Amino acid sequence: WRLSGALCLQRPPLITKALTPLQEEMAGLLQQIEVERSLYRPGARETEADKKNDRTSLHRKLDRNLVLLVREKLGDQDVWMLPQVEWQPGETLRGTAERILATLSENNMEAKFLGNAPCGHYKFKFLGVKVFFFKALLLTGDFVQAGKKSRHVWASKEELGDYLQPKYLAQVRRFLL
Amino acid sequence: DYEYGVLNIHLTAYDMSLAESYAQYVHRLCNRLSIKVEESYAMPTKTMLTTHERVVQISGLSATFAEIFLEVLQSNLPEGVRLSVREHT
Amino acid sequence: EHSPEESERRALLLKRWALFKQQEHEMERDAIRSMLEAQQEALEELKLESAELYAEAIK
RNA sequence: GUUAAUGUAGCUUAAUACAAAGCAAAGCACUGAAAAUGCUUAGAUGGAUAUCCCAUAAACA
């Protein structure tokens, strides 16, 4: 059997929508009492303005969340895949998950693996194979080599359907936000 | 037998009321999701202007539960509050 | 002092705010269950293929 | 299509009678927090009969 591991990376949305003006006037009111009752170079809000086409760059979007999606090549297949790597029984899922972070992306991205339990598994057969879909949280991401020759794409769910058609790959949305 | 440790959330915001409002709001998020909150301690002012930091203790998480919760907190972010997750001493 | 129209205008937005939040909470609760069900469903899938693999994973 | 599921609102075989009920659950107010407490918010027969039924989703296919 061919053992293959994959990682469904999650990128946080940096900035939420602006508050309504009706909230602002209330915010001003509470601020005034707050003082009375008180007891004793920045990055651009959106860094896509210059790029407009850098799907490769980690910062494809800042207002919304993103999920890494990397074109992968197998021995007999070449299809658009979620970050995929070959793993062994000795290595645990987090160890396989950690290897995916540096192997495929070769970057100093900041990720923490809190839960060893995997979120998704889908099998494609023609040779029996299975793909492991892990989940993790990103506080921040430092993606080196933005312009790689590979087709790595950071898209949460909008492009998941476009690039991952079959339910074995289009059902990743089930455990996605 | 291992379970998620108790991780304190230090809500730092220049506005005292906003941190308190968010601290109460996030706690309302916590109890609804069945998150136990043992304490709501308050840090001293960050004398330099000053800022106010309020603790919201969180005990008990799950792998799927943690992933969903943290994004919800980010979306819940009203204005100019810095989230923080740190393992309890 | 706020006028009755101002209170009526504010009364409406609180209803909208409450409606939005309750919808978010219901969606959030379903998200917890859906991911947990998928994660639990994910656990079963590999167990059939090889239980030995999870032995490292569960640690 | 064969087997098989699944078809009152988180839960219930509460109910088809005199009501689509009870329960879980929510917002705001009250300022350690929570709870308590007051005022309030959102809801369902996707559907029949005394098994078909279409929808849905699986092993057969």
Swiss-Prot record, chain A:
The modification N6-acetyllysine is found at residue 130. It is found in: Mitochondrion. The keyword Ribonucleoprotein applies. Keywords: Acetylation, Mitochondrion, Ribonucleoprotein, Ribosomal protein, Transit peptide. GO terms for cellular component: cell junction; cytosol; mitochondrial inner membrane; mitochondrial large ribosomal subunit; mitochondrion; nucleoplasm. Transmembrane segments: none annotated. The modification N6-succinyllysine is found at residue 148. GO terms for biological process: mitochondrial translation. The keyword Transport does not apply. One of its GO terms (molecular function) is structural constituent of ribosome. Belongs to the mitochondrion-specific ribosomal protein mL46 family. Component of the mitochondrial ribosome large subunit (39S) which comprises a 16S rRNA and about 50 distinct proteins. This is Large ribosomal subunit protein mL46.
Swiss-Prot record, chain B:
It comes from the Eukaryota. It is found in: Mitochondrion. Signal peptide: none annotated. Disulfide bonds: none annotated. Component of the mitochondrial ribosome large subunit (39S) which comprises a 16S rRNA and about 50 distinct proteins. Interacts with OXA1L. Belongs to the mitochondrion-specific ribosomal protein mL48 family. This is Large ribosomal subunit protein mL48. The gene is Mrpl48.
Curated annotation (Swiss-Prot), chain C:
It is found in: Mitochondrion. It comes from the Eukaryota. Ubiquitous. Belongs to the mitochondrion-specific ribosomal protein mL40 family. Component of the mitochondrial ribosome large subunit (39S) which comprises a 16S rRNA and about 50 distinct proteins. This is Large ribosomal subunit protein mL40. It comes from Mus musculus (Mouse). The lineage of its organism: Eukaryota, Metazoa, Chordata, Craniata, Vertebrata. The chain holds residues 105 to 163 of 206 of the full protein.
